[PDB]
UniProtKB/Swiss-Prot annotation, chains A, B:
Monomer and homodimer. Interacts with FRK1, eRF1 (SUP1), eRF3 (SUP35) and polyadenylate-binding protein PAB1. Interacts with ETT1. GO terms for molecular function: ferrous iron binding; L-ascorbic acid binding; peptidyl-proline dioxygenase activity; poly(A) binding. Present with 8910 molecules/cell in log phase SD medium. The modification Phosphoserine is found at residue 534. The lineage of its organism: Eukaryota, Fungi, Dikarya, Ascomycota, Saccharomycotina. It comes from Saccharomyces cerevisiae (strain ATCC 204508 / S288c). The keyword Iron applies. Keywords: Dioxygenase, Iron, Metal-binding, Nucleus, Oxidoreductase, Phosphoprotein, Vitamin C. It comes from the Eukaryota. It holds the Pfam family 2OG-FeII_Oxy_4. Its cofactor is Fe(2+); L-ascorbate. The gene is TPA1. PROSITE patterns: FE2OG_OXY (PS51471). Transmembrane segments: none annotated. This is Prolyl 3,4-dihydroxylase TPA1.
Amino acid sequence: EEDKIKGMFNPKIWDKTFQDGLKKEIEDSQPYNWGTIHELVNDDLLRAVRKEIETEIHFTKKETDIYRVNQSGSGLDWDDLSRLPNLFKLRQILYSKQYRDFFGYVTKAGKLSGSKTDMSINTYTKGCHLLTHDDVIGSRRISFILYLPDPDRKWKSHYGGGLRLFPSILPNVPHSDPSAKLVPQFNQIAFFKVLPGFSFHDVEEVKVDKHRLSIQGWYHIPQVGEEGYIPGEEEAWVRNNTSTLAQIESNVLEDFEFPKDERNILSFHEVKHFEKMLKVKLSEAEFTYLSQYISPEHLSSKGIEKLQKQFVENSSLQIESFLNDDKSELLKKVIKQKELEQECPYHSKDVKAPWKTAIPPHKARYLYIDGKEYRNFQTEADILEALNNNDLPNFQFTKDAIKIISDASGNSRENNFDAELALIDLAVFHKSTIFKKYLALLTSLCPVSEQILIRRFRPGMDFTLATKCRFNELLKSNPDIIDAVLEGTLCLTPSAGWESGELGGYELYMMDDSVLINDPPAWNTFNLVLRDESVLEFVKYVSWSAKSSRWDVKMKWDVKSCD
Amino acid sequence: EEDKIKGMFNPKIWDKTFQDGLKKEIEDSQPYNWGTIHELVNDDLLRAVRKEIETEIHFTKKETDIYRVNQSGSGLDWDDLSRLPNLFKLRQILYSKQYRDFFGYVTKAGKLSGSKTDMSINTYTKGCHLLTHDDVIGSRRISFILYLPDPDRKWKSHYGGGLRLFPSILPNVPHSDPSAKLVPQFNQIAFFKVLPGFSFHDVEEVKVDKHRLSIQGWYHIPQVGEEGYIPGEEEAWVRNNTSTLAQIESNVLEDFEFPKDERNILSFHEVKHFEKMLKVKLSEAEFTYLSQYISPEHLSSKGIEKLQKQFVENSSLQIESFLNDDKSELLKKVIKQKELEQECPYHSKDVKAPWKTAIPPHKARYLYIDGKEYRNFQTEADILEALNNNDLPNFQFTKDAIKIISDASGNSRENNFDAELALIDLAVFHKSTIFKKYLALLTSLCPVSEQILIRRFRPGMDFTLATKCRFNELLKSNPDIIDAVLEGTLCLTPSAGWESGELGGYELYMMDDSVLINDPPAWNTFNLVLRDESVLEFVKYVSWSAKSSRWDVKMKWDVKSCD
Ligand SMILES: [Fe+3]
Ligand SMILES: [Fe+3]
């Protein structure tokens, strides 16, 4: 009762002057309303809870596209906490009427469910992380995290594990870079009211070899019977954030994704060449042209049949030493040089031509070169300007634009476009008619469209999430054109240590064990995959631990059978 | 007989030493084998023939896409030449065995038909012309023209009317510029053996106010019964130059046309905007954006309904004062400035970025800006390089490339890109999402693809020939997408005197009287036409007489009904 529960918290939290001060502070916070309280719970109680958890619970590593976490979601039954009396106590006081009134008041959330408790316990160790998300699930009204690292030592900034908040360009379109970061200590709580479209946050990777324990939880909309229940409130809420969010997603939101998952159609000269060949396959002039980039191993009569058969068998190809030695060395030299001697931008504002940042961060983040005009999305107007003035990729005009920049600034070991120029030449090569003629030979498919990107995934920044291919809307009715996207990836990652996947950066292909391909970055490999609409793909978040970025060239084609 | 026929020609032509000398000369001629003979026929006979024709025959003007000629093809019956005994005589000696042996020998043509005579009589007056063609029809083996201008005065070079020969980049792909020109006198014959793919020639416009009379003719493959008849020769020949030329046309030759008649597909952001609107139509922000270029007359509530109704009625729009006053003046100023103070290239080699020359000349010739990388087709390799490395239009990257040229060379009244920059801004505007939203409103059609070109048709050079629209091959199966190309033309011709069509430059739309539209160049007009596959279009050859080039912006879209 009352006094027994209030005694388990810092006495300050029951003080009206403190409460008003805190409500004001949360009201003035940026980038959206959040709060923090130091030394929330009674020290002894919380020390005990930490002891119980270290002693009573096992934590297993779990990796998805969006997180690596040691969870207990093996020891933990929320309906039987008999062996963990201290935790049971914490859960009772955190959901008590006294605390729910306090918490609802300072966050301006209104009333909170007493019965519907929702907690999980996690540890973050080196490499653990949670990417950008907003917490909008079901009936959640407030998010909190209570932190329990070592009570007798300061958790430092460079340890990582910070709670990071994101400012917003529009509703549902957060900025790529965070504008606030909380470095939490023991017995500190962080919390915010859930804001569909705004409450974007993540957990910064833990960077050093330590264990950060925490209790994550949510307060829910009052349920039927409880204080502050309103009939139809929860269902209105859930409806709005689900079926109708999906409705706004297709109608509007996909427009604010960059790069767009769209392909440009090939000319009739190209398509005719492919067709004729499919219904003395390549000329000598053509092998000569191909041999400038491609290893003779894959251009030989037997290399081809081998690849043809693998593709017919698996609907996929994983080639090694794809490029020849002349190109492999040049690319390795210029890429290593850039990695070791030049500064990589670590903020979207610092990214310059020919590079761009993929957005938004709750879908993806990475640097890419698309051959389009320079774009740096810092405001709504920046975005609308692009959507009004869409342009087409021109890799040659990008080499040109590099020279105007290179000649008005000079060149040096610290600032040059050698890597960019080499990679664009690679891109031009893969856009040539003769390359696609070679692709058509390997696969017996006839490409009818293409998109090429050069991508760089920075350590500690960059990642995609699991998604399906996007069918060319306009072509869906053409029965000759296969219900599939052919997808290529040329990995050009020069550094070592990827093999176990612990550093991230792996390309993952899976069924909606369902894993079809799981390739950590390597040097000069080429994956070709013909995806149906059910196949999911992503590149995993690259860890701060990694010695270089993942560099690749990404290619997509719409295809038709010539029978 | 024999001696009576040989006496009607210059006695030199019967001389073996002359004959061998002439055969050698024809053998050494460029750009393909041709010959000429001064004073071929007996002077008196030819003077008489000239008198008969001036006295006995009327000549009527006839204009097509490819020529303006005063013909007799009213006086002239080849089966009854009783009132023209001298001409009958000429025709008998020109087709005589004696002359056919001589002519067949020097041209290395072999035997020639005696019975199958083929002649026509024409005069070229100011403005008369015949564009690039090769003479390959049916059974023709040798072309000749015999010239009968005024016998007692020199026909000068600047009079025009020269016979011009074209060098070849590949078989069937002549160079845009001629490499030989014959200025003919009275009693001179010009002639060549017919060469499928090579014998390209034209008649230079007559530039001054005079009358050039001539007799054009052909010698044919020997017919059944005649000397040198070979069964199946003629039919092999005809077959090869018809059905199988058409086969090579579709398989290969269209690849060497520039610009290509191809459109790039719009993004899903664009298509969705158009659809939503078609199934408080434009926002104020949108009218504001549109009003920067378009005259308020056409943006008003009633201007729109008016245009909507005209389009539903005719499947076409002809708008006047399309652009507003601010843009109309700027464009007129920069275009007039260029016309009056800068030098226009008059040879494909002299054409510089951002401009290109349409090719080949037996299909079209004009200058255009497509937003693609610079291309100057002087060799086979130039062409194959483009086909291997196709690129996509980027009008913004073309403004960029202009600055690298402009800043390494400086600007002046004699050399600047003001006109080009203004026209590209116009092009960017018409490629914007909001413009196409306006286009969709006028027409109730939803654009799904686009091509834009800025074109300049030089006086004395430039023209297109009557052609059909090209359906997007890839889309033909999509039943939502209309079997039509929407086609726009913004004329920006600043000079006067076009009204009667005598200067050329008119846009002609017709049925395969069949004329649907016939618009001489004017200032700031916009034509919109929805072409089915049967509609033919061309811009007429611009005369040397014209005071400026025809300047326009040309736009094409694939479209779908939203019902
Ligand atoms: Fe969260
Ligand atoms: Fe001719």
